Structure formats: C-alpha cells, structure tokens
Design a protein around this nucleic acid. Sequence first.
RNA 1: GCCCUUCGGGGCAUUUGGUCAAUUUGAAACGAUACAGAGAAGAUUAGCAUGGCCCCUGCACUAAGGAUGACACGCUACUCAAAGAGACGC
Lengths: 94, 122, 108, 48, 132, 75, 98, 322
Amino acid sequence: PPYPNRAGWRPRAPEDFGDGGAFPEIPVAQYPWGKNDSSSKSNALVVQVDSEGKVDYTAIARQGHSSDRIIHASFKDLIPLRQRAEAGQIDLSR
Amino acid sequence: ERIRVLNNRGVAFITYTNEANAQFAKEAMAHQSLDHNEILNVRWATADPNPLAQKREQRRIEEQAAEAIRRALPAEFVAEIEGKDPEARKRRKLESSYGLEGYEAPDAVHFARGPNAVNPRG
Amino acid sequence: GTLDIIETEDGEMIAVDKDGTFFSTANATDFAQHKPDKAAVDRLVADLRKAEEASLKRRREKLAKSGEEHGDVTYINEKNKQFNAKLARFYNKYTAEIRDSFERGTMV
Amino acid sequence: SAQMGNNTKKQERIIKIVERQRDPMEPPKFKHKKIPRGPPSPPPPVMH
Amino acid sequence: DFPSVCENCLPENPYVKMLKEDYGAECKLCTRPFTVFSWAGDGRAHGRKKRTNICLTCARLKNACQCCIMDLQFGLPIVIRDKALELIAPGPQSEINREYFAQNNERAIEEGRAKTDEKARELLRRLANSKP
Amino acid sequence: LAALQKRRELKTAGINIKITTRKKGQMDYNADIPFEKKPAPGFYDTTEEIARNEWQRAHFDPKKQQVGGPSASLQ
Amino acid sequence: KEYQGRKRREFEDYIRRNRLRLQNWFQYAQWELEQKEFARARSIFERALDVHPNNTQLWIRYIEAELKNRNINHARNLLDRAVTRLPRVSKLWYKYVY
Amino acid sequence: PRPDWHPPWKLMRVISGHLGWVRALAVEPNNQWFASGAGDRTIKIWDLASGQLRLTLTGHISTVRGLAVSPRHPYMFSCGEDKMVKCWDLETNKVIRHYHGHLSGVYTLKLHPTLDVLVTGGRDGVARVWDMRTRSNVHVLSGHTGTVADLVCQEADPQVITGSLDSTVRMWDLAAGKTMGVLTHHKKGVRALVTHPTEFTFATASTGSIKQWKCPEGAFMQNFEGHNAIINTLAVNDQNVLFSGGDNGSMSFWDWKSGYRFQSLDTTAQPGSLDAELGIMSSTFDMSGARLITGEADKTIKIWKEDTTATPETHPIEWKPS
RNA sequence: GCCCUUCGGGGCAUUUGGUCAAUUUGAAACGAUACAGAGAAGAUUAGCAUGGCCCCUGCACUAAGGAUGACACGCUACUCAAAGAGACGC
Ligand SMILES: [Zn+2]
Ligand SMILES: [Zn+2]
C-alpha cells in the first residue's frame, strides 16, 4: 500500500513492511525485522560489525587487549604496503 | 531460634537470631561451667549438611536481600512488578503502554531509575 | 524479509536474495543463535568415541606386538629394549659388517 | 552519587588528607610473599 | 588516591579530616598491603579511627565500601549479595590463589583492560511466586 | 592402605576426627581451582552448558570408579 | 576427595617441575575430565595454552576434549579462537569445517 | 619500484688478532677507531684507517656480545655472556659502572639516541632499560618468551623495538614500559634488527626472511627474499644499503627501497679455519658509510669497500619487473 | 583567667588520641619421641650448577655455606594411517 492510504490495513509480517521500516501513521506495535524479547544474560560476545557492514572476527583477536594496541589479525596486514588498495603515497619521514 | 542437641555423645548446636547475640553468647560461655564441673567447648559451628537447614539458611539469605531491595526500590515499583494484585497488573499494562496497544516496553526502560527517566519516579 | 519472491516474464517463481546470507551465515548475526540437532551431536560424539576406541586398540596391539620377542636378548628392561630397537632401525644399514663379525667370530 | 539508601543532610564534602606521622624506628610492617608469575597478556595471531 | 567510602561510614561533618598511610595495612580480603585512609568519628569516647579495610582492587571487583564491606547498591553483606543475587563474582579464597587472582586483576586494570538490578528483579521473580 | 582401613573402621565405629592435611609451604588444591584461568567468551552462549557441566560434577558417582595359536615352524 | 587431593598434588608438582612437557598438562586435564570436573579441566587446558600458545596438538586436544562431552558452544568458541590464533594451520581449519 | 644502482663491495683488509669469534663492533662518533668485542673475552680498540691495534681491554670473563660508544659522553659500554653490563670511562680506560640484574647471558646493548638511557637485551628473555647515571633498572620490558637477540633504540615511538628468538618482534612505548605492538610474521628466531637513518622504517631478520616495516604502525612494507641462511646481522648505509650477513658465511647487499639484491658473496676464512667456521657474527658500517666492518667466526675483522672502478654499465641492474 | 573600653562593648586562647592494663578461642617455636642411614648405571666418594607456590645462616637483594642444602628418579593411546590378500562373511 503506497502513500498515503495505509489506514486500517495493519502489517502482520516484515514483508508487509515493503522492504522494512515501521509505518508511523498506524498506531500499533510494529517490528520491521523481529522480536528480541528477553535473552537470559547469554554471556557470548556481542557480534559487532566491521566498516563495510560485515561480521568482524577480529573481536576474538582483540579480546583482552587495550584499544590502542596494534594487533595484526587479517590477511590485509600480510600485503606489502604499496600493494594495498588503501593508499599509494606514504610519507616515510622521521 | 534453633537449639539442636545430640545427647548420645552430648554436643549442641545453638542458632541465635543476631550476630551480636551469637558472639556475646560465644564469648560469655567460653570455658564457663555447666552444672557439672566441666569446661565447655564453645566454638563457631560448621554449616549443617542437613538439606533442610541449608534450604532455610538459603531462604534467609534471599529474604534478607529481598527486604533490602524492597526498601531500596519504590513501593510502586515493588507492587507493579510483584504481580499478585490484579490492580497492579492492569496498572503495569496502562503505565507501560504509552499508547501503541500491545507494546509492553522492556524492563530496562520501564523499570529504569534515572535523573530524567520515563516513569512516575519518586 | 530477507528473501524476495518474484515472477519473471516467463512465468516461474524465482527467489532473489536481498542479502547474501542465505547459503552462508557469514554477514549474518543469527549465526550466534543456531542450535545443532541432537542426532547430529550424537553422531559426532559417537564418531569421536570410535576414533578413540580405534586408537586404544592400536595402542594395545602395538604393546602386544612389541611384547613378543624374536632373536637374541640384548636389553635389561623395556626402555632399553625400545632404545635398542630404535638403534637397530637407524644403524643397521651402517654396521652390517660388524654384525656379521659377531655372527661369524672373525674378520669384518 | 546515589548510595545504599537515600541522602540525609548534606551531599558535597570537603576532605583534608594528610599523611600519618609514622614512627621513625618501625621496621617494615609486613613480610613479603612468593607468588607465581601471572598469565601473559593474550597472544596475537601467528601471521606466517 | 581516594577511598570508596559510603556516607554511612564518613562520620557526620561534610568537612572531614582524613589520614593516609601507604602500605598501612594488609587487605582483609586479598591480604596485600594497600593505602589506608582513616578518619575520625561522631564521638571522642573511643579513638578507634574507623578506617578502610579492603583495597581499591577488592573494593572495585566486589563492588563494596572499603570500611564496612557491604554493597554499594543495596547495602548487603557481600556474601548475602553473592549468594542471593547469585553469580557475579565468587572470588577465590585460598592461600596462594588469593594473591594470584588479586595480582592478575590489578595487573589487568593498570594495563587498561577491564546488570545488577536486572538480577535483583529476577530475584524478586524467584521469590514472589515461591512456596516452601 | 593401612591408614585408610583404620579410618573406615573408626568411622563406622561412631568416632569421626578429621586430621590436618594442611602442611606448611604447600597448597591445598581442593579448596578451589588452582590458578583459575576461565575460558574466554566467544560468539556462542555457554550458560546452559556451564549449568549442565556443574550438574554433572555435582552428581558424579564415587561408586563407579575403581583404581589399582599357530605353530613355531611357521613363525 | 583425599584421592583427588593426592592426584592434584602430584599433577601440579609435575607441572611445576617441567611446564614445557605437554604430557603433564595432557594427563592432568584428561584425569580431571575422567572425574567429570569440567571447570578444572578447562582451567588446566587454558593454562597449558598460556604456556604453549601456538601448539596445534594442544589446541586439538582441548577442542576434542570439549567435543566428546557435547559442549558444542564451548568447542565452537575454541575453534574460533584456534583459527584466530593460528590462521595458517590447515589442520585447525579442516577440523572446524568437519 | 625501479632500484637505484649501487657499486659492488669487495674485500679491502683482513685483521687477525682475536682468539675468539668477533661478536661486537662499535665505531666512534668521530670515525677514528672501532671496537671489537670477542669470544676471547676482550675488547680491542683498532684505528679505522690503518687497521692497527691501539689497545686491548679485559673486564669480562665471558664473550663480549655487545658494544656501544656513546656520542654524547666519553664512555664505552659493553655487555657479555657473564651477566654483566659495564661502563668504561675512556679518559681512564677503566670500568667505572656496573648494570647488574640480567639473570643469564646478555646478548645485545643499545643507547637511546637523545636521552641518557641504556637498553640491554638478554637470555633471561627480557630487555632491561637502565639509567646511565644511577645504574638503576628503570624498566623491565618483559613479554617475550625467548632470548632477546637484538634490539634498537629510536628517537620517537616506538622507542624500543626488541627481536627475540621465539620469533616475535615487540615494539615498546618507553614512557610506560609496556608494549604497543607485536609482529609475529617471522617463522624463526629474529636475530637482527636495524633502523634506517633517514626514513621512519626498520628491518628485522630471521632465517631466510628479511622483513621491512613502517613505524609506528608496524605495517608490513616489503620483504627482502633470497638469502636462505640464518641471518645474524643487518646494516643499512645512508645511501640505502642493507647488509645481510649469514651464519653460513653468506653476504647479501640489498637496496633498501626496492629490495633488489645487487650483490651476493661468500666470505673467506683464515688459513687454519674449518669449513664449519665460515660465518659472519657481527657487522656495522662506519659513521661515514664508505666501509663495512664485519666480524666473523674465523676470529677475524674484515673491512669491505665499494668498488670505484665499476660503472652502472659494467654491473647493470638485472631487475625483472613482474 | 587576664586585658582594652567611647562603658555600648570588644580582645587573647580553639578539637588530643593506635580493642583498655586484662595471655585458653586470631594463630611463635624447637627440642623430645619411635626413628632415621648423606648423590652420580660394582665399591668408596671432591664438588659446580640447573628450575622455583622449598627454604635456612649471613651485611652480601652482585660473597660463601647449609649432604654437591634439599626437591628431581613418577606417569606414558589421542595432529594418526595406506596399499595387498584372505574369509558354508553379510
Ligand atoms: Zn584486596
Ligand atoms: Zn561504609
């Protein structure tokens, strides 16, 4: 149901949301993806996300360390610095 | 509170109600005489392995913690969480609705104490 | 909402993956919440017990095979026997002439 | 901050901290103890 | 460089006079020498000088006042807390394991590396519908 | 073995005296786990498995543990 | 309890005498597993991993010791830590995929 | 990167005179003399131009595994396998200070370039940071699980970089005495470290691999490859010359930027030396960079010079891009 | 208690301090007892180390000694198979 006629019609599934995002003009408990009701203090590490929007398994490598510590934990750290796709101009100066 | 006695070999376990009375009775009867001319051995008592005694000492621990928590929390929060009064249940629904029927806000937000908060507070 | 069902111009159902997390649980947080089946757990555990039982049988068979003696006795305990067999395994290819000098009673 | 119960009379406090006049003749108070070395900081990945 | 002491213990006066001694006593929990902060009282009848009794490491890990050794949130004796609210922090209590654990915790905290009311509510739920 | 036999004969006789096993200079490895190093938490919750392992340890049975062809021509 | 005191004392004595021999850690952890002491067995394996962090045999022993007792979530944490610590060891990756 | 042309190096002078392997080598700031510490427990001071023996100093009861002549002070420091780190007053030719505390034999010794601090590394697996004046062990840089075989001091963070025989390389923040990073790229014992003088890069050498890193990130920049021997030393010029000396006796001269091996040699042993005794144990360029002083397991100081006869055409850069 | 005062007033001086003296139940130890019988693949033996939840004497925490101070000596599947040939096999 496009704009501006969704009155009376309530979404029942996340497919009823279109691609998602709760409809603010219908007063009802809307959840665009699902329910996280109560997790009984599950002691797992919280699954964080890296810069490009993917799962990060360096959170196991960095565990028990300070944030300012240099830790090589990926294959990118094995590549020579010129051949990395991040940059090409590096100031090698004291 | 309890006076377990085992006459077959003659040893007693005396459970008072207070720390102060227990220590006063311990240091007051240290090598003190009974009716017979003997020297008593009044030590601290190792915990009983009787499952009942363990269960009731545990229950004393949780009721003491509950007493302190109920003193610390607002009485409105205690009643609204307690879930025995139907008035408390419907008060909980109406207060942790904020419109949007069928919401039922999380405990971390509904039962939250803070400077600003979203609650009657106190 | 992750899978979208479409009908093409030819008239058939095609499931299109909005994410890429259908066939693999990477890039998907739900991988933390999966519970493996009890039958598969029993299968893996039983396979581990089978490997352990085979290794125990191999240990007992090796002990029984080395417990059987053949030829002369040149040791005094079991560690000496194992060391002497290791010495044989390494050094027979170099001391054949001295070996036959002992087996012969004369020249190398 | 908040505490075990509630607040009673005054919150802000002014505290005067001075070192204690210890006896010049006292030796060390406590015997030193032999404790095993702690575990290392978590090792890094082996980037071979 | 400052004790974690509840208002129950800090005597009456908002202007308090406090003494400090480096390595003045051993911790009552972890038995390691720590800085003692001893103040005055609400009466000049017995000069006990109510002092700290546990170190800031043991104060922080078990989350209790240094003088009276009871909880900062609820005001429970710390075993009552760790046995009724349950879990949180058992803490070793043996001869060498005690200083081992304290040593490692202090080493971690100095090197940077590191929900009570939720378990209080869960305790309320276990007790409200309970029956002996 | 002699001391154990005497201990079980005196325990069933009614008398019960525990002896000081705490020698100086040495540790009691039964009071608590010696130099505990708990496993680090990963991305998977382990709470129910920890509870099950504690249940297994608590109900461990002491009563199930006890310690202590052919001819010569062809070969 | 007295028997377990003897065995723990002997095993810890041999840990203290030669910490670089892996058989001491392995036998101590195996014996504690056979006593169904899982926290103690995990502690022994973790301390052995402190002494020998990049040992593939020790890693596989600790993973398999927690797989034989149906501790699947524990063992998957172990396998993530193992292939994080040792990314270029093919055996750990093979064991995780298997 | 297209490599620069560097002239090949040849043997100039061979100086016999120690009775043990020459493990240490240290040039004066003024380039007049250099210091060879050797397995015959002695430190010899040699004139650099003539090569003649000026003096012999004996204060160690074991092999001298490290030397440093201070650029600010009239001191010479040494360390040896006898657990001892000593400070020699060169206005008297006498030991005036001890730096005690290493539990076993001491393998390396460097001075902080700016401020008056001495860092030593040792077989007790640790790098001790000492004050020169008060001889007080201000820091005990610990965390390696093996012998600290080499070590560099630097004017900015990371100030201390230690390479150990358990194959890791740790970069240490000197103010706090705790590590800011670990580099675990090497497969075996990292026996050599060196710091480029003008670029903010450094190089570590294990057996077969010489890896080049960027400060302070520890970012893997490149890899000198081809020298399949145990590398004992590493020496970079001002003109971008890396010297990998190897325990089998193998010498490799590389260009620092590209990684191109412009020369490969095998050194020669004295009359009387076994073929097992062919090997380079120490090396340093002098202050100018025109000479390379190596000290070898045939108990020999050797001086290596650039060939002025050779042209860029007589020795062309046989570098094949891929 | 003194001192000043225009007799209204004011001034000088300012918060010590470790359960108490109280010997069982907040922690000290040898002797003594029954003993015991000083390491290196036969016998007798000089030692010097090594590692530390083992210490003792000593100023030695940069000697030396304590039987070379003692401890050490036990335990032992688990990164784990492959081909070939046999079976009133199934
Ligand atoms: Zn403490
Ligand atoms: Zn308090």
